[PDB]
Amino acid sequence: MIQRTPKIQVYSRHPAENGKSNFLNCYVSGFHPSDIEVDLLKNGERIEKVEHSDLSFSKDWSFYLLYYTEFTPTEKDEYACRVNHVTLSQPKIVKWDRDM
Amino acid sequence: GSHSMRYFFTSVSRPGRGEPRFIAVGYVDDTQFVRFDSDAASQRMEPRAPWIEQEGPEYWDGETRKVKAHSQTHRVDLGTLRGYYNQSEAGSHTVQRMYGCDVGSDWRFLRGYHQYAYDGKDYIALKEDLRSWTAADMAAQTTKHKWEAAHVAEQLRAYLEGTCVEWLRRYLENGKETLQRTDAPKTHMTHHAVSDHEATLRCWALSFYPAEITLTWQRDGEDQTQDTELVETRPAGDGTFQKWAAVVVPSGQEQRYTCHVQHEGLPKPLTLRWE
Amino acid sequence: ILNAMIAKI
The missing domain is CATH 3.30.500.10 (MHC class I-like antigen recognition-like)
Known part of the structure; x- marks a missing residue:
């Protein structure tokens, strides 16, 4: 059956400023079927309190979801998004870049 | 509208x-x-x-x-x-x-x-x-x-x-x-030296509503569509959206490149230039 | 508001 790979973007809601409260976003879109596992990572460890938007889909029927959590960026803390899906043989990890 | x-x-x-x-x-x-x-x-x-x-x-x-x-x-x-x-x-x-x-x-x-x-x-x-x-x-x-x-x-x-x-x-x-x-995009540019003879120019559009927007780069006025990295418009999570467009420019050619923003919340289209 | 009639396929 139809299987489409998720596109992954990891980014902050506001421009990253060290010491200022923000939201870390991981946006997964373009995927099919709907089962997908998304985790936000702080220095390689899974963040517990992560929320996500309500499952919706684009005109071509592929799904999109926004996972997000409050965070205060620092100079040294590294963040990333870890996504697993039927189209991925192993989890795909995208590192957060504050000018991407 | x-x-x-x-x-x-x-x-x-x-x-x-x-x-x-x-x-x-x-x-x-x-x-x-x-x-x-x-x-x-x-x-x-x-x-x-x-x-x-x-x-x-x-x-x-x-x-x-x-x-x-x-x-x-x-x-x-x-x-x-x-x-x-x-x-x-x-x-x-x-x-x-x-x-x-x-x-x-x-x-x-x-x-x-x-x-x-x-x-x-x-x-x-x-x-x-x-x-x-x-x-x-x-x-x-x-x-x-x-x-x-x-x-x-x-x-x-x-x-x-x-x-x-x-x-x-x-x-x-x-x-x-x-x-x-309508929330007009807040726009800015970044410049990152990738190596010693080329650099990434990235044109940002932030905090805009609704999602529809046009972000393009030109060199000497010529469209750079095949040479522009364009990310999908993405939700900020507060009801606004984000998008950027990037181009790799040889060092010393930054003045040739213009970024163009078309959005319903702008009084008129934007032309941005690294200078 | 939603439609009130939903026919089965």
Whole structure:
């Protein structure tokens, strides 16, 4: 059956400023079927309190979801998004870049 | 400007794991305002925008009742579609449904939609005239004949041209501050030395609504479409959107490159240049 | 608001 790979973007809601409260976003879109596992990572460890938007889909029927959590960026803390899906043989990890 | 209202329904069978999943969401333009989740505790249609919260108990009780009637139909549809295609009970399958209406700048009916998909492919859809059906394969034609005999398109057309646009207008007036707004993009550039003889120029657009936007780069006025990295427009999570476009420029050529921003919230298109 | 009639496939 139809299987489409998720596109992954990891980014902050506001421009990253060290010491200022923000939201870390991981946006997964373009995927099919709907089962997908998304985790936000702080220095390689899974963040517990992560929320996500309500499952919706684009005109071509592929799904999109926004996972997000409050965070205060620092100079040294590294963040990333870890996504697993039927189209991925192993989890795909995208590192957060504050000018991407 | 023009406006739309859309409802999206997802139904996923869960063999051995009980009832199928069912998620419904409603949108006005790019703003979600209602949702229903079969796995959530409330078993109600729930508000997702502040301007829909003033709707009283009758609205919520009626939308809850109707959304349950959508859920029950999709629960049956999964079994029915499984039979049409001679599929086993062991596999999970997906049904999606979308319908809604478009209004133009005069806020009168412009277009109506009702689309249905099985396992990621078009299954059956109402044609633009809101009177005939487009059926993808042989199985879909059995549904088409059933819906033609039951005059399903006649009732859908009345909903799409009547109820749908009337309540769209009501939502637009009630949520005027949220739905009749435009947030212009806040724009800036970044410059990152990749190596010693080329650098990445990235044109940002932030905090804009609605999602529609055009971000392009030019070199000496010539479009750089094949040489521009363009990310998909993405939600900020606060109801606005983000997008950037980047180009790799040889060092000393930054002055040749212009970034162009077209968005409804701008008084006129932007031309940006690293200088 | 939702449509009140939902025909099964």
